[PDB]
Design an enzyme around this catalytic site. Structure first.
Site, PDB file in Angstrom:
ATOM      1  N   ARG A  54     -56.652 -21.104 -10.476  1.00  0.00           N
ATOM      2  CA  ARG A  54     -56.597 -22.200 -11.438  1.00  0.00           C
ATOM      3  C   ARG A  54     -56.747 -23.525 -10.698  1.00  0.00           C
TER       4      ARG A  54
ATOM      5  N   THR B 151     -56.554 -16.758 -16.688  1.00  0.00           N
ATOM      6  CA  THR B 151     -57.735 -16.560 -15.859  1.00  0.00           C
ATOM      7  C   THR B 151     -57.894 -15.086 -15.513  1.00  0.00           C
TER       8      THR B 151
ATOM      9  N   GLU C  82     -41.508 -16.264 -15.965  1.00  0.00           N
ATOM     10  CA  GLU C  82     -42.667 -15.427 -16.254  1.00  0.00           C
ATOM     11  C   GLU C  82     -42.610 -14.118 -15.470  1.00  0.00           C
TER      12      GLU C  82
ATOM     13  N   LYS D 122     -26.953 -49.951  -3.511  1.00  0.00           N
ATOM     14  CA  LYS D 122     -27.010 -48.507  -3.395  1.00  0.00           C
ATOM     15  C   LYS D 122     -28.447 -48.093  -3.632  1.00  0.00           C
TER      16      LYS D 122
ATOM     17  N   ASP E 242     -19.615 -44.674  -2.486  1.00  0.00           N
ATOM     18  CA  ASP E 242     -20.222 -45.946  -2.854  1.00  0.00           C
ATOM     19  C   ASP E 242     -19.168 -47.035  -3.007  1.00  0.00           C
TER      20      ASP E 242
ATOM     21  N   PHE F 209     -49.526 -24.288 -13.310  1.00  0.00           N
ATOM     22  CA  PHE F 209     -50.033 -23.110 -12.615  1.00  0.00           C
ATOM     23  C   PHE F 209     -51.146 -23.428 -11.614  1.00  0.00           C
TER      24      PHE F 209
ATOM     25  N   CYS G  36     -32.064 -33.398 -19.430  1.00  0.00           N
ATOM     26  CA  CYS G  36     -32.862 -32.604 -20.351  1.00  0.00           C
ATOM     27  C   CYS G  36     -34.182 -32.383 -19.638  1.00  0.00           C
TER      28      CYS G  36
ATOM     29  N   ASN H 143     -11.722 -41.056  -4.817  1.00  0.00           N
ATOM     30  CA  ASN H 143     -12.908 -41.466  -4.080  1.00  0.00           C
ATOM     31  C   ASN H 143     -12.553 -41.996  -2.695  1.00  0.00           C
TER      32      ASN H 143
ATOM     33  N   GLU I 191     -49.136 -26.909 -21.085  1.00  0.00           N
ATOM     34  CA  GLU I 191     -49.359 -27.411 -19.733  1.00  0.00           C
ATOM     35  C   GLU I 191     -50.266 -28.620 -19.518  1.00  0.00           C
TER      36      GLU I 191
HETATM   37  C1  LIG Z   1     -21.855 -35.207 -10.554  1.00  0.00           C
HETATM   38  C2  LIG Z   1     -21.008 -36.008  -9.591  1.00  0.00           C
HETATM   39  C3  LIG Z   1     -21.462 -37.309  -9.243  1.00  0.00           C
HETATM   40  C4  LIG Z   1     -20.684 -38.120  -8.313  1.00  0.00           C
HETATM   41  N1  LIG Z   1     -21.178 -39.409  -8.022  1.00  0.00           N
HETATM   42  C5  LIG Z   1     -20.630 -40.195  -7.033  1.00  0.00           C
HETATM   43  C6  LIG Z   1     -21.174 -41.480  -6.587  1.00  0.00           C
HETATM   44  O1  LIG Z   1     -22.177 -41.924  -7.104  1.00  0.00           O
HETATM   45  N2  LIG Z   1     -20.504 -42.172  -5.548  1.00  0.00           N
HETATM   46  C7  LIG Z   1     -19.303 -41.700  -4.883  1.00  0.00           C
HETATM   47  O2  LIG Z   1     -18.784 -42.331  -4.000  1.00  0.00           O
HETATM   48  N3  LIG Z   1     -18.786 -40.546  -5.337  1.00  0.00           N
HETATM   49  C8  LIG Z   1     -19.352 -39.771  -6.353  1.00  0.00           C
HETATM   50  N4  LIG Z   1     -18.781 -38.589  -6.779  1.00  0.00           N
HETATM   51  C9  LIG Z   1     -17.566 -38.143  -6.091  1.00  0.00           C
HETATM   52  C10 LIG Z   1     -16.255 -38.118  -6.853  1.00  0.00           C
HETATM   53  O3  LIG Z   1     -16.476 -38.153  -8.271  1.00  0.00           O
HETATM   54  C11 LIG Z   1     -15.332 -39.229  -6.331  1.00  0.00           C
HETATM   55  O4  LIG Z   1     -15.063 -39.063  -4.936  1.00  0.00           O
HETATM   56  C12 LIG Z   1     -14.081 -39.265  -7.232  1.00  0.00           C
HETATM   57  O5  LIG Z   1     -13.732 -40.640  -7.397  1.00  0.00           O
HETATM   58  C13 LIG Z   1     -12.916 -38.478  -6.692  1.00  0.00           C
HETATM   59  O6  LIG Z   1     -11.923 -38.551  -7.736  1.00  0.00           O
HETATM   60  P1  LIG Z   1     -11.157 -37.328  -8.360  1.00  0.00           P
HETATM   61  O7  LIG Z   1      -9.948 -37.914  -8.996  1.00  0.00           O
HETATM   62  O8  LIG Z   1     -12.052 -36.484  -9.201  1.00  0.00           O
HETATM   63  O9  LIG Z   1     -10.725 -36.482  -7.080  1.00  0.00           O
HETATM   64  P2  LIG Z   1     -10.070 -35.066  -6.757  1.00  0.00           P
HETATM   65  O10 LIG Z   1     -11.230 -34.132  -6.637  1.00  0.00           O
HETATM   66  O11 LIG Z   1      -9.057 -34.840  -7.816  1.00  0.00           O
HETATM   67  O12 LIG Z   1      -9.369 -35.421  -5.383  1.00  0.00           O
HETATM   68  C14 LIG Z   1     -10.209 -35.795  -4.292  1.00  0.00           C
HETATM   69  C15 LIG Z   1      -9.489 -35.820  -2.945  1.00  0.00           C
HETATM   70  O13 LIG Z   1      -8.591 -37.052  -3.069  1.00  0.00           O
HETATM   71  C16 LIG Z   1      -7.185 -36.627  -2.717  1.00  0.00           C
HETATM   72  N5  LIG Z   1      -6.413 -37.564  -3.558  1.00  0.00           N
HETATM   73  C17 LIG Z   1      -6.551 -37.892  -4.911  1.00  0.00           C
HETATM   74  N6  LIG Z   1      -5.715 -38.803  -5.391  1.00  0.00           N
HETATM   75  C18 LIG Z   1      -4.964 -39.115  -4.298  1.00  0.00           C
HETATM   76  C19 LIG Z   1      -3.830 -40.060  -4.058  1.00  0.00           C
HETATM   77  N7  LIG Z   1      -3.344 -40.832  -5.040  1.00  0.00           N
HETATM   78  N8  LIG Z   1      -3.252 -40.147  -2.770  1.00  0.00           N
HETATM   79  C20 LIG Z   1      -3.712 -39.365  -1.690  1.00  0.00           C
HETATM   80  N9  LIG Z   1      -4.765 -38.466  -1.842  1.00  0.00           N
HETATM   81  C21 LIG Z   1      -5.374 -38.349  -3.121  1.00  0.00           C
HETATM   82  C22 LIG Z   1      -7.125 -35.187  -3.103  1.00  0.00           C
HETATM   83  O14 LIG Z   1      -6.064 -34.492  -2.477  1.00  0.00           O
HETATM   84  C23 LIG Z   1      -8.507 -34.647  -2.641  1.00  0.00           C
HETATM   85  O15 LIG Z   1      -8.605 -34.484  -1.231  1.00  0.00           O
HETATM   86  C24 LIG Z   1     -19.413 -37.594  -7.721  1.00  0.00           C
HETATM   87  C25 LIG Z   1     -18.994 -36.244  -8.124  1.00  0.00           C
HETATM   88  C26 LIG Z   1     -19.737 -35.444  -9.029  1.00  0.00           C
HETATM   89  C27 LIG Z   1     -19.124 -34.096  -9.303  1.00  0.00           C
HETATM   90  N1  LIG Z   2     -39.164 -26.933 -24.164  1.00  0.00           N
HETATM   91  C1  LIG Z   2     -39.936 -26.199 -23.374  1.00  0.00           C
HETATM   92  N2  LIG Z   2     -41.307 -26.432 -23.398  1.00  0.00           N
HETATM   93  C2  LIG Z   2     -42.238 -25.768 -22.654  1.00  0.00           C
HETATM   94  C3  LIG Z   2     -41.740 -24.713 -21.756  1.00  0.00           C
HETATM   95  C4  LIG Z   2     -40.347 -24.498 -21.745  1.00  0.00           C
HETATM   96  O1  LIG Z   2     -39.926 -23.531 -20.914  1.00  0.00           O
HETATM   97  N3  LIG Z   2     -39.495 -25.238 -22.543  1.00  0.00           N
HETATM   98  N4  LIG Z   2     -42.764 -23.976 -20.982  1.00  0.00           N
HETATM   99  C5  LIG Z   2     -44.053 -24.634 -20.716  1.00  0.00           C
HETATM  100  C6  LIG Z   2     -45.035 -23.690 -20.121  1.00  0.00           C
HETATM  101  S1  LIG Z   2     -45.003 -23.425 -18.326  1.00  0.00           S
HETATM  102  C7  LIG Z   2     -45.946 -23.026 -20.881  1.00  0.00           C
HETATM  103  S2  LIG Z   2     -47.165 -21.875 -20.127  1.00  0.00           S
HETATM  104  C8  LIG Z   2     -46.052 -23.133 -22.344  1.00  0.00           C
HETATM  105  C9  LIG Z   2     -45.821 -21.763 -22.922  1.00  0.00           C
HETATM  106  O2  LIG Z   2     -45.718 -21.718 -24.316  1.00  0.00           O
HETATM  107  P1  LIG Z   2     -46.991 -21.819 -25.300  1.00  0.00           P
HETATM  108  O3  LIG Z   2     -48.050 -20.882 -24.790  1.00  0.00           O
HETATM  109  O4  LIG Z   2     -46.575 -21.452 -26.703  1.00  0.00           O
HETATM  110  O5  LIG Z   2     -47.471 -23.242 -25.347  1.00  0.00           O
HETATM  111  O6  LIG Z   2     -45.018 -24.084 -22.875  1.00  0.00           O
HETATM  112  C10 LIG Z   2     -44.681 -25.240 -22.000  1.00  0.00           C
HETATM  113  N5  LIG Z   2     -43.677 -26.049 -22.702  1.00  0.00           N
HETATM  114  O1  LIG Z   3     -52.981 -19.557 -16.252  1.00  0.00           O
HETATM  115  C1  LIG Z   3     -53.508 -18.510 -15.878  1.00  0.00           C
HETATM  116  O2  LIG Z   3     -54.722 -18.574 -15.735  1.00  0.00           O
HETATM  117  C2  LIG Z   3     -52.768 -17.316 -15.626  1.00  0.00           C
HETATM  118  C3  LIG Z   3     -53.430 -16.122 -15.183  1.00  0.00           C
HETATM  119  C4  LIG Z   3     -52.709 -14.904 -14.913  1.00  0.00           C
HETATM  120  C5  LIG Z   3     -51.305 -14.896 -15.096  1.00  0.00           C
HETATM  121  C6  LIG Z   3     -50.615 -16.040 -15.531  1.00  0.00           C
HETATM  122  C7  LIG Z   3     -51.367 -17.228 -15.786  1.00  0.00           C
HETATM  123  O3  LIG Z   3     -50.641 -18.292 -16.195  1.00  0.00           O
HETATM  124  O1  MOS Z   4     -48.272 -20.911 -17.843  1.00  0.00           O
HETATM  125 MO1  MOS Z   4     -46.368 -21.464 -18.001  1.00  0.00          MO
HETATM  126  O2  MOS Z   4     -45.426 -20.090 -18.166  1.00  0.00           O
HETATM  127  S1  MOS Z   4     -46.576 -22.054 -15.987  1.00  0.00           S
HETATM  128  S1  FES Z   5     -33.166 -28.996 -21.540  1.00  0.00           S
HETATM  129 FE1  FES Z   5     -33.013 -30.355 -23.241  1.00  0.00          FE
HETATM  130  S2  FES Z   5     -34.101 -29.384 -24.877  1.00  0.00           S
HETATM  131 FE2  FES Z   5     -34.285 -27.985 -23.123  1.00  0.00          FE
END
Ligand SMILES: Cc1cc2nc3c(=O)[nH]c(=O)nc-3n(C[C@H](O)[C@H](O)[C@H](O)COP(=O)(O)OP(=O)(O)OC[C@H]3O[C@@H](n4cnc5c(N)ncnc54)[C@H](O)[C@@H]3O)c2cc1C
Ligand SMILES: Nc1nc2c(c(=O)[nH]1)N[C@H]1C(S)=C(S)[C@@H](COP(=O)(O)O)O[C@H]1N2
Ligand SMILES: O=C(O)c1ccccc1O
Ligand code: MOS
Ligand code: FES
Ligand SMILES: NC(=O)c1ccc[n+]([C@@H]2O[C@H](COP(=O)([O-])OP(=O)(O)OC[C@H]3O[C@@H](n4cnc5c(N)ncnc54)[C@H](O)[C@@H]3O)[C@@H](O)[C@H]2O)c1
Ligand code: MOS
Ligand code: FES
Ligand SMILES: [Ca+2]
EC number: 1.17.1.4
Lengths: 1286, 99, 50, 50
Positions: free
Chosen positions: A842, A972, A764, A392, A330, A876, A146, A321, A1223
């Site tokens: 600014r 500004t 913007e 890690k 990992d 800004f 978020c 993995n 801001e």
């Molecule tokens: C947001 C995100 C965060 C991640 N974080 C981490 C992390 O912190 N640490 C880390 O190490 N990895 C991380 N990963 C990597 C990934 O999630 C792992 O490598 C995962 O365990 C792979 O599993 P899968 O089943 O999704 O693989 P797939 O994508 O389904 O397969 C992966 C590969 O394994 C082969 N394969 C699968 N099962 C077998 C099997 N039984 N026998 C032979 N080959 C096989 C496939 O052919 C392919 O080449 C991340 C990925 C994402 C998208």
């Molecule tokens: N949730 C959320 N809050 C935010 C933003 C946004 O994009 N999402 N923009 C920020 C920025 S860069 C500015 S300039 C101001 C703009 O809105 P305001 O003039 O009503 O405060 O909100 C701030 N707070």
């Molecule tokens: O913050 C400012 O002063 C400003 C000035 C011009 C245009 C965008 C901006 O945010």
């Molecule tokens: O002034 Mo916010 O849109 S950087």
């Molecule tokens: S990204 Fe979570 S409320 Fe905007």
């Protein structure tokens, strides 16, 4: 092909032509019309696409529920699986589910784009554990990001499942008996044995194998066939690596691949077992089995704690993995160090081998044959005299890629300290998981002692070498980690063998969560205030409920027209070069291809940009990687993407200027030097007892709004008319830029902005890059066209915060009083001017922060470089200048040997003082915020506690810092400080308000409705704001500078006054009548119930030439005290506690304002400690996704997070005595940076040197790399000229 | 607009009142979020009443631009409009008529 | 009447707060708006007629 | 109005009108209508929320 049958929200789905490449996200959004689930990154790191999956587990004999990323889940893996999206648990049209109600009422939703995903992560948790613990609740979001809230409200509201901003007593209790039942039809289908399925797509064939025999037969016949289980690797390879696997075999259903066996040597897991399953099983084993037998299990568990998030771990398989064999896996280092047994099979063969260094011969390869598949893995029980550790370290604790990761095992002779076996395996130190065999071999038969530690460290330093050009960089940091990890292992083993020095103990402790403590203090409204007057009350964001329900419509959620086409930008892959030719021959072959658009297709002008120094489409030359050259239009987004990818551009490189240093050396700047100078510097420095000079750098920042840039352009076919739906904070510029490109009058273009899933300044101006391209596509094709950027496109093209390089010189007295300051600022502006000038202005306006400097000189230069043009980003320019200010201020304190807070206080402005730009500080509340923050944060008491902790800890240190801030409020640029509103009162008395401002999550519309309700003295229920549009309020300034509430509030107020004046005669003639009565009377008497409202901020107009005139209408102030604990051995740190006292005048809405304070603070926290963009020397961005760009995560926020809004401080300069809050709070995040700096000083005093006045440089962001490298010790030192003059 | 040429006439009126070519004026559509509580387009009085409303709106615009016209009499409509904008003078207004 | 174009309405449900945008062949956007709001049981400010 | 492009998910409505000048509606059977391909629903007085 077989039919794909699954359920979505209880409804049966029969897909007769399932395409293996179709993700659940795409299916939900484009085929089922369920747009609640969002696309935030397409790489599993944001969780915006989170959904719940339910299935009958045959091996467990029960229904299981787990979360998953819809963006990575192939629908072909979902046969007979029940999907639940945000729409499936509740809605405002029916009834909100408790999860939705609470996140909404607790102010846990701002822009709302991340809300559905977080709602689903929480929902899934509750379906598994109706009464979760606080820790389980936090862990539920390891994979959810978020950017708006600062997370605090989401966690505090959900904590209820385990004056005030919200009342938990009003929450509807959770009743599991009322949850949707598992689809009865699916429960029946469980009684029919699985059958192999075949799915045929446009390019891929998918075979769902039902038995091991089928899998092996298939692999024998198709050795190349790519196995896919969780698709968390393959999905990435397909989407981001341009990989195409014609044939996929999913073995997930096979019993053998999912079997869990508890043997005498260890626990065996089928290769298809999800990591979440392995984790659950190992946790159970650790709880039941003797500690001495679970050493390896706990190592695996430690890695799993920081392995992605719940969504990924629930689908990611163990086999995946291991076989992916990523250099940064990992788990492989752990499996290798523990000799985990791998059972490998193929038709007719079966073998079991312990994983060792030879298993991974080269990059991304393993010792498996082409026909072989990994069947099962047996994680070994640890033996007597055998200990294990797994570590890690990444850029962020949660869901990050390891920089260095390891598995370490040692086996001693029976009951001794004599090494029998030693295995130190690392990830992130080569193009594959490796073992430091040379080093460990030398220790066999040696005893666990200091000499062994020294020898192993020296060995590691030599054996695990990294060439200067090693991929991933951070050479020193990674090598230091390899030794540091061993040191931790060494100390931990000593502890397990046992007398360890008390000050060394914490070095062996694994990360531990501390219970959260959040407190928000704000002012109650006057006792006699009407309940209908909501101004000053914590009213939740008006769209929060709809955002939690996924009903809130964002740009791409708008249904596509039947004839709507998709656009994909074609961008430069060169930082600077001539475009010799463009070949579309291959693109034209892609199915659904409509056309390729380029500069010559523009009917009007190809000159665009805030300062007309940009092209809509590159002409002759490209000036940055990401420079838009053209665009492909196709019938689907996938086809547009594929076609654009094969468009061949031939370049001829031109000398490129990438860095600020490059620009300076080449005198490559935009415009002339900006400068503010007051007093007599020469004289100032003469008077100074001390003078400190230095250089400081602050890295950029990617906005990372959860919703990327998006535009839908609808060509009407009449008089050049075009209606566009855009995710932008600047409808006016969007409108004029589109009109300019088309060569038509501005009155022909209509821009409508419902809401943005985040903007933060990034929308913007840079939103036009996409809008104009899409507009051209609509113009040329005559069809509606849309484009939503993928995260990698967005981060590469749209620009971010300006990196700043500063050269400063400060003169001060022994007392810490500042008497002279010179600061030369340099920002990396990129390939266009855009808002770079105002940003630097600014910056100059805030180089003083809250300190009076009699003699000061500040200059700024905009560096013209071959990088995407940087733009506005919350702050800004202020955050950069404020950071530079606090940096030398922190050095002044150290140099003087005086308490930082004392030095800051004595230099602080006082009521009535003039700033360096000569504006009087009226209502300067910093002093109150400062004293109140000191008190409520118990600063002094904690300061001593921090020193105590540091004396008691050698490898961990704490830091504490309290910093103030003031932020000038107003554009500004004088003319932008204007605002219009349009209000209509319909005959039923309902009111429709329209104003020039846009909603991006900050709750502007909410505040405007609150304002209108108070002004008209009618309930907010009778007022509504639908959208922002150029045909209701024209020539609007961009929603920026934090002044939207101020100015649109006045415009709305004025419009309301006019309405009241018109209704007055009718109210008088019928005093006891209702609002409705008066309105109908006015209508019947032919009195217009429609009017505009306008506001122009008075007395503004500063000149840099004369250093005179009011630059700002007023200033918003605040103070923040933050305490941190750094791990001197890894660079990781905990944000222990943060106390904020913010002056937002008389808040119009304390809930939204505290939300802005926390959100801004966390974004600042990210800027200064976690977020870092990396570019190749050639200027190509490496960091293009959440996997590599780490913004603050749920676990990144201060454990104890307290926010207080200053009491009794009305601001007569703004609507209803309020103050801008957007801001101003962001810079307070720097309090964390300086607490870290304080902690590092303690670490350096401990192991570096004895110079208590040393001034070591620490640039922003203070990442684990910078923190660790700064903690110079015997390890960093380990990681010779012929002669030297004497 | 139902074919009677009401928008055409309103543009003609606006052009005469503002003293600028009709080419600089445009009417895209009729919508409840721009002009509320409108009487149905009927009784043959649309030209009469909306013509007055448009006329009045134009008068308000002219009055706001007057300072800039006086300031730069030889300037163009575009110059005055931009000057007005730069000086933060609203270029949006309602017009109303009651027979 | 025999207007060459017969009666026609396109109604777009926004999915938020009862909001609906309608494109209508009518001389009375006001009554279309109020009548639609009345039938739906939502405030008139939720209905946009173009 | 009808020249405005239809959304990909845009549906079509056909009014069901009385064939009698004055009568009581005894019952309405849509069992045959429901068999027509593409049938989504039959709307009547009870469907009105307002
Ligand atoms: C947001 C995100 C965060 C991640 N974080 C981490 C992390 O912190 N640490 C880390 O190490 N990895 C991380 N990963 C990597 C990934 O999630 C792992 O490598 C995962 O365990 C792979 O599993 P899968 O089943 O999704 O693989 P797939 O994508 O389904 O397969 C992966 C590969 O394994 C082969 N394969 C699968 N099962 C077998 C099997 N039984 N026998 C032979 N080959 C096989 C496939 O052919 C392919 O080449 C991340 C990925 C994402 C998208
Ligand atoms: N949730 C959320 N809050 C935010 C933003 C946004 O994009 N999402 N923009 C920020 C920025 S860069 C500015 S300039 C101001 C703009 O809105 P305001 O003039 O009503 O405060 O909100 C701030 N707070
Ligand atoms: O913050 C400012 O002063 C400003 C000035 C011009 C245009 C965008 C901006 O945010
Ligand atoms: O002034 Mo916010 O849109 S950087
Ligand atoms: S990204 Fe979570 S409320 Fe905007
Ligand atoms: O994405 P990926 O699959 O290449 O994984 C990347 C990480 O592996 C390591 N890596 C790969 N090849 C390397 C090499 N030749 N030298 C040092 N580290 C290497 C780096 O730390 C890099 O950040
Ligand atoms: O008054 Mo005309 O619409 S009969
Ligand atoms: S879009 Fe799926 S995790 Fe971000
Ligand atoms: Ca720029």
């Amino acid at each position: 092909a077989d039919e794909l049958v699954f359920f979505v929200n209880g409804k049966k789905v029969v897909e007769k032509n399932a395409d293996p490449e179709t993700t659940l996200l795409a299916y939900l959004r484009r085929k089922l019309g369920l747009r609640g689930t969002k696309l935030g990154c397409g790489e599993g790191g944001c969780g915006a696409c989170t959904v719940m999956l339910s299935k009958y587990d045959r091996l467990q004999d029960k229904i299981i529920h787990f979360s998953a990323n819809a963006c990575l889940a192939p629908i072909c893996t979902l046969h007979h699986v029940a999907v639940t999206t945000v729409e499936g648990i509740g809605s405002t049209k029916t009834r909100l589910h408790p999860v939705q109600e609470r996140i909404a009422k607790s102010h846990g939703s701002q822009c709302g784009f991340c809300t559905p995903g977080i709602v689903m992560s929480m929902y899934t948790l509750l379906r598994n554990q109706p009464e979760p613990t606080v820790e389980e609740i936090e862990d539920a979001f390891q994979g959810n990001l978020c950017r708006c809230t600062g997370y605090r409200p989401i966690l505090q509201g959900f904590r209820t499942f385990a004056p005030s901003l919200f009342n938990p007593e009003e929450f509807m209790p959770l009743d599991p008996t009322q949850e949707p039942i598992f689809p009865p039809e699916l429960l029946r289908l469980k009684d029919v044995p699985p059958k192999q399925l075949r799915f045929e797509g446009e390019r891929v064939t998918w075979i769902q194998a039902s038995t091991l025999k089928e899998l092996l037969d298939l692999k024998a016949q198709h050795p190349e066939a790519k196995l896919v289980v969780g698709n968390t690797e393959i999905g990435i390879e397909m989407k981001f690596k341009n990989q195409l696997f014609p044939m996929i075999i999913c073995p997930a259903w096979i019993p053998e691949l999912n079997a869990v066996e508890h043997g005498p040597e260890g626990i065996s897991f089928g290769a298809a077992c999800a990591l979440s399953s392995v984790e659950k099983t190992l946790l159970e084993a650790v709880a039941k089995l003797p500690t001495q037998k679970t050493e390896v299990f706990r190592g695996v568990l430690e890695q799993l704690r920081w392995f992605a998030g719940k969504q990924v771990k629930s689908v990611a398989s163990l086999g995946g993995n291991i076989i992916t064999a990523s250099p940064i896996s990992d788990l492989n280092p752990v499996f290798m160090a523990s000799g985990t047994k791998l059972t490998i099979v193929s038709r007719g063969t079966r073998r079991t081998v312990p994983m060792d260094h030879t298993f991974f011969p080269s990059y991304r390869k393993t010792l498996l044959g082409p026909e072989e598949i990994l069947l099962s893995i047996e994680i070994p029980y640890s033996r007597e005299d055998e200990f294990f550790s797994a570590f890690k370290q990444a850029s962020r604790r949660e869901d990050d890629i390891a920089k260095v990761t390891c598995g370490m095992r040692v086996l001693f002779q029976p009951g001794s300290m004599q090494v029998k076996e030693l295995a130190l395996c690392y990830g992130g130190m080569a193009d594959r998981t490796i073992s430091a065999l040379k080093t460990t071999q030398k220790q066999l038969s040696k005893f666990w002692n200091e000499k062994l530690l020294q020898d192993v460290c020296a060995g590691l330093a030599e054996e695990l070498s990294l060439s200067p050009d090693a991929p991933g960089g951070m050479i020193e940091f990674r090598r230091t980690l390899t030794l540091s990890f061993f040191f931790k292992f060494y100390l931990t083993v000593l502890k397990k063998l046992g007398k360890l020095d008390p000050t060394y103990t914490s070095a062996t402790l694994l990360f531990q969560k501390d219970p959260p403590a959040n407190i928000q203090l704000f002012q109650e409204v006057p006792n006699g205030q009407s309940k209908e007057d909501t101004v000053g009350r914590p009213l939740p964001h008006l769209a929060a409920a709809m955002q939690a329900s996924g009903e809130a419509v964002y740009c791409d959620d708008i249904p596509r027209y039947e004839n709507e086409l998709f656009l994909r930008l074609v961008t430069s892959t060169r930082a600077h070069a001539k475009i010799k030719s463009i070949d579309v021959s291959e693109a034209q072959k892609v199915p659904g291809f409509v056309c390729f658009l380029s500069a010559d297709d523009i009917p009007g002008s190809n000159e665009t940009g805030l300062f007309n120094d940009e092209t809509v489409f590159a002409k002759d030359t490209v000036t940055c990687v990401g420079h838009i050259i053209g665009a492909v239009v196709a019938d689907t987004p996938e086809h547009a993407e594929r076609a654009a990818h094969v468009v061949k551009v031939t370049y001829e490189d031109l000398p490129a200027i990438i860095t600020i240093e490059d620009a300076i050396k080449n005198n490559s700047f935009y415009g002339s030097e900006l400068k503010i100078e007051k007093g007599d510097l020469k004289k100032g420095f003469s008077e100074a007892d001390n003078v400190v000079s230095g250089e400081l750098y602050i890295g950029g920042q990617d906005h990372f709004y959860l919703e990327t840039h998006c535009t839908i352009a609808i060509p009407k076919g009449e008089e050049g008319e075009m209606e566009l739906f855009v995710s932008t904070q600047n409808a006016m510029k969007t409108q004029s830029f589109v009109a300019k490109m088309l060569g038509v009058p501005v009155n022909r273009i209509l821009v409508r902005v419902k809401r943005m899933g985040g903007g933060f300044g990034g929308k913007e101006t840079r939103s036009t890059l996409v809008s104009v391209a899409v507009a051209l596509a609509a113009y040329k094709t005559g069809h509606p066209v849309r484009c939503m950027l993928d995260r990698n496109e967005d981060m590469l093209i749209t620009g971010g915060r300006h990196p700043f390089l500063a050269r400063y010189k400060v003169g001060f007295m022994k007392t810490g009083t500042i008497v002279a300051l010179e600061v030369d600022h340099y920002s990396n502006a990129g390939n266009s001017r855009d808002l770079s000038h105002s940003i630097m202005e600014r910056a100059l306006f805030h180089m003083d922060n809250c300190y009076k400097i009699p003699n000061i000189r500040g200059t700024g230069r905009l560096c013209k470089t071959n990088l995407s043009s940087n733009t506005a980003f919350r702050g800004f320019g202020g955050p950069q200048a404020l950071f530079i200010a606090e940096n030398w201020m922190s050095e002044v304190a150290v140099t003087c040997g005086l308490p930082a807070e004392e030095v800051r206080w004595k230099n602080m402005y006082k009521e009535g003082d003039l700033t360096h730009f000569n504006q009087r500080l009226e209502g300067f509340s910093v002093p109150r915020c400062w004293d109140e923050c000191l008190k409520s944060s118990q600063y002094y008491a904690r300061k001593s506690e921090v020193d105590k902790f540091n004396k008691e800890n050698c490898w961990k240190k704490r830091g504490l810092c309290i910093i103030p801030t003031k932020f000038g409020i107003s554009f500004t640029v004088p003319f932008l400080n204007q605002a219009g509103a349009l209000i209509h009162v319909y005959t039923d008395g309902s009111v429709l308000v329209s104003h020039g401002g846009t909603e991006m999550g900050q709750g502007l519309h909410t505040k405007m409705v609150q304002v209108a309700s108070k002004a008209l003295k009618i309930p907010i229920s009778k007022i509504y704001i639908s959208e922002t549009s150029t045909n209701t309020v024209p020539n609007s300034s961009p929603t920026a500078a934090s002044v939207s509430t101020d100015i649109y509030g006045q415009a709305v107020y004025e419009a309301c006054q006019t309405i009241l004046k018109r209704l007055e005669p009718f109210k008088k003639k019928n005093p006891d009548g209702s609002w409705e009565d008066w309105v109908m009377a006015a209508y019947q008497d032919r009195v217009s119930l429609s009017t505009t409202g306008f506001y122009r901020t008075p007395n503004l107009g500063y000149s840099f030439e004369t250093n005179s005139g009011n630059a700002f209408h007023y200033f918003t102030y605040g103070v923040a005290c933050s305490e941190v604990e750094i791990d001197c051995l890894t660079g990781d740190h905990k944000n222990l506690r943060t106390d904020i006292v913010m002056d937002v005048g008389s808040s119009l809405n304390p809930a939204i304002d505290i939300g802005q304070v926390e959100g801004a603070f966390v974004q600042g926290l990210g800027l200064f400690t976690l977020e870092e963009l990396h570019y190749s020397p050639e200027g190509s961005l490496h960091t293009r996704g959440p996997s590599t760009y780490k913004i603050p995560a749920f676990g990144s926020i201060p454990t104890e997070f307290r926010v207080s809004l200053l009491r009794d401080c009305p601001n007569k300069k703004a609507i209803y005595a309020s103050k801008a809050v957007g801001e101003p709070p962001l810079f307070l995040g720097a309090s964390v940076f300086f607490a870290i700096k304080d902690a590092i000083r303690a670490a350096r005093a401990q192991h570096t040197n004895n110079n208590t006045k040393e001034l070591f440089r620490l640039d922003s962001p203070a990442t684990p790399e910078k923190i660790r490298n700064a903690c110079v010790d015997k390890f960093t030192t380990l990681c010779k000229p012929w002669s030297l003059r004497v």
